[PDB]
């Protein structure tokens, strides 16, 4: 029943405008936090901005301070990033996603095409399996983070997914052959049983500090 719909995106000059619009349903939206999360072709996730419930409070990452302004319609339960000044940079499938840091619920997301903190380590960047494999993936951190890391899947041309949350509890209606584990640095996401609908790329992100940094992925192909 929840519903992020965007739209906005699209082919735009250098120094060009955008305004992306993501319609929210199926919930109370000002009862949350939002965020705007942009992740380059064929790179991993980056935080782009957060807006908090009420509206009041800004967040924003440092490449796209000054340029880019998040903003919400209570009302109508919409949110809204205005971006000016386009870089090549920018060119991203940006994606609301709900929640300060969990990020429970992501948006198909819209195509832009324009034409110090803690890192996060996965391995392996890519592998091969069959169904029923035994898969183990690993998240090291340059910092401890403690519990704050969440598991995310991503199949191709869709949105992330919420796995796992705080390490190791497993987010609700999620199967159980997903297991998260790791309690400072190093994190292991487990699918006792690979079925076909895995084969995607996994991600790994942190909350500990600001901003929250994204794991470079885990390709789990056939």
């Known amino acids: 029943e929840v519903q992020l719909l965007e739209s906005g995106g699209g082919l735009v000059q250098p120094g060009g405008s955008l305004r992306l619009s993501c319609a929210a349903s199926?919930?109370?939206?000002?009862?949350?936090?939002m965020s705007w999360v942009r992740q380059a072709p064929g790179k991993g996730l980056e935080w782009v901005s957060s807006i908090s419930d009420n509206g009041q409070t800004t967040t924003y990452a440092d490449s796209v301070k000054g340029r880019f302004t998040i903003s919400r319609d209570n009302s109508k339960n919409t949110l809204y990033l205005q971006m000016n000044s386009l870089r090549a940079e920018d060119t991203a499938v940006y994606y609301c996603a709900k929640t300060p840091y969990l990020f429970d619920y992501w948006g198909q997301g819209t195509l832009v095409t324009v034409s110090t903190d803690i890192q996060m380590t996965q391995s392996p960047s890519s592998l091969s399996a069959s169904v029923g494999d035994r898969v183990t993936i690993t998240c090291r951190a340059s910092?401890?983070?403690?519990?704050?890391l969440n598991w995310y899947q991503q199949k191709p041309g869709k949105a992330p997914k919420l796995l796992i949350y705080?390490?190791?509890h497993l987010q609700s209606g999620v199967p159980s052959r997903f297991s998260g584990s790791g309690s400072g640095t190093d994190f292991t996401l487990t699918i006792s049983s690979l079925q076909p609908e895995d084969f995607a790329t996994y991600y790994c992100?942190?909350?500990?500090?600001?901003?929250?940094?994204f794991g470079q992925g885990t390709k789990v192909e056939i």
């Open positions: 705080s390490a190791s």
């Open positions: 199926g919930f109370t939206f000002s009862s949350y936090a």
């Open positions: 910092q401890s983070i403690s519990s704050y």
């Open positions: 992100q942190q909350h500990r500090r600001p901003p929250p940094t």
